[PDB]
Amino acid sequence: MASRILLNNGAKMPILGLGTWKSPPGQVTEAVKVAIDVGYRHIDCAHVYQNENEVGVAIQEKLREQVVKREELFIVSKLWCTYHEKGLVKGACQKTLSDLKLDYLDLYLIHWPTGFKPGKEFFPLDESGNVVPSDTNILDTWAAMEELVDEGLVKAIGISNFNHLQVEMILNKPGLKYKPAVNQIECHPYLTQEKLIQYCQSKGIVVTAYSPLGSPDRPWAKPEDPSLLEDPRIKAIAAKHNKTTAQVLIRFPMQRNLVVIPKSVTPERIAENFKVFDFELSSQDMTTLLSYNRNWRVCGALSCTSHKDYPFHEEF
Numbered sequence: 001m002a003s004r005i006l007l008n009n010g011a012k013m014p015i016l017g018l019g020t021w022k023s024p025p026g027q028v029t030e031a032v033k034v035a036i037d038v039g040y041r042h043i044d045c046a047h048v049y050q051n052e053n054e055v056g057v058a059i060q061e062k063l064r065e066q067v068v069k070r071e072e073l074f075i076v077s078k079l080w081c082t083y084h085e086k087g088l089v090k091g092a093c094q095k096t097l098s099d100l101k102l103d104y105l106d107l108y109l110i111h112w113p114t115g116f117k118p119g120k121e122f123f124p125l126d127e128s129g130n131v132v133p134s135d136t137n138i139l140d141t142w143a144a145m146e147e148l149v150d151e152g153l154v155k156a157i158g159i160s161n162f163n164h165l166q167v168e169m170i171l172n173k174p175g176l177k178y179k180p181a182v183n184q185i186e187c188h189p190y191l192t193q194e195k196l197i198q199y200c201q202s203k204g205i206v207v208t209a210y211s212p213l214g215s216p217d218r219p220w221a222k223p224e225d226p227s228l229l230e231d232p233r234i235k236a237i238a239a240k241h242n243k244t245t246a247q248v249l250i251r252f253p254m255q256r257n258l259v260v261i262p263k264s265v266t267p268e269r270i271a272e273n274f275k276v277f278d279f280e281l282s283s284q285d286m287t288t289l290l291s292y293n294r295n296w297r298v299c300g301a302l303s304c305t306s307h308k309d310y311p312f313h314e315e316f
């Protein structure tokens with residue numbers, strides 16, 4: 001299968017990237033170095049993950065070693081919720097660029113549609129635990145993102161965790177200058193996202209699937225929770241193909257024309273997870289995996305469920 005997908009900005013994006021949320025700062029430099037050594041050319045980052053400096057050490061070392069040229073890498077980061085303000089977006093992007101050791105990002109995403117009060121705290125709370133919103137709307141934040149393209153800081157801009165009405169708001173923005181290139185959303189066999197994926201793809205927006213293994217290391221996991229990697233039905237499909245369960249879970253979104261960003265800090269798994277370009281799931285396999293949908297969403301925040309732009313009240 002082709003390794004890159006053409007974006008609506010004219011650039012090509014590798015369909016497999018390395019995730020970095022929860023990758024400890026003392027392990028992520030080696031993880032990214034290993035990833036680049038074994039073929040990864042796309043790294044998914046974010047300021048809120050608090051490890052961009054260490055990711056950047058790895059990127060810079062592989063560039064210095066001439067393992068890879070900058071033009072061959074596709075580095076993604078995301079604008080955190082406390083920076084949705086016109087006057088804060090550029091500095092937030094610049095801090096990410098500084099930490100990553102880069103002079104541009106290939107893609108910069110609005111991390112969540114919800115803006116929060118600026119300040120040191122990533123989740124500013126009122127005394128009852130509700131997040132404190134910003135009044136800056138998604139359209140003004142989008143205009144600020146467009147300026148980053150025009151200033152050369154980023155090659156492409158996009159969105160993440162936007163529901164279809166929020167995507168539509170951007171697409172209908174008066175004076176829209178650059179369409180979102182990507183919507184990065186949670187997607188795996190227990191949350192298959194058909195409706196939102198078809199909407200985005202019909203608009204030429206590429207979808208990136210996050211938490212493709214179900215984020216079993218998410219901090220709020222419970223022992224009784226569903227487990228994709230341990231689902232016997234998925235293990236059976238993997239065994240039939242002589243592949244691991246993780247490899248099936250990564251190949252699945254690829255065959256839906258999605259980009260996918262599995263996270264690992266384990267060198268053997270980083271290498272294994274990349275070995276997904278030499279087998280094909282049948283259309284029966286694909287439809288069978290889709291059938292496991294249970295609308296089981298692992299990534300959200302209770303503190304945000306009354307924010308006016310909370311994305312998950314809408315069906316999709």
Ligand SMILES: NC(=O)c1ccc[n+]([C@@H]2O[C@H](COP(=O)([O-])OP(=O)(O)OC[C@H]3O[C@@H](n4cnc5c(N)ncnc54)[C@H](OP(=O)(O)O)[C@@H]3O)[C@@H](O)[C@H]2O)c1
Binds near residue numbers: 214273
């Ligand atoms: N835009 C957003 O709002 C958003 C939200 C969530 C995630 N994301 C992005 O998407 C990335 C991936 O999602 P995620 O981190 O939530 O979870 P994930 O990639 O679904 O799962 C990561 C977990 O799977 C384990 N794992 C990886 N490969 C494995 C294999 N071959 N066999 C067994 N276990 C394996 C990892 O263990 P080890 O690391 O210990 O090997 C880790 O515990 C994130 O890191 C982040 O970059 C974005």
Ligand SMILES: O=C(O)COc1cc(F)ccc1C(=O)NCc1cccc([N+](=O)[O-])c1
Binds near residue numbers: 049112299305310
């Ligand atoms: O947001 C991600 O990429 C993954 O999850 C997190 C990563 C972090 F480093 C810190 C926090 C989260 C997290 O709680 N993310 C969830 C989240 C964030 C913002 C808004 C909402 N919302 O429902 O509107 C949900």
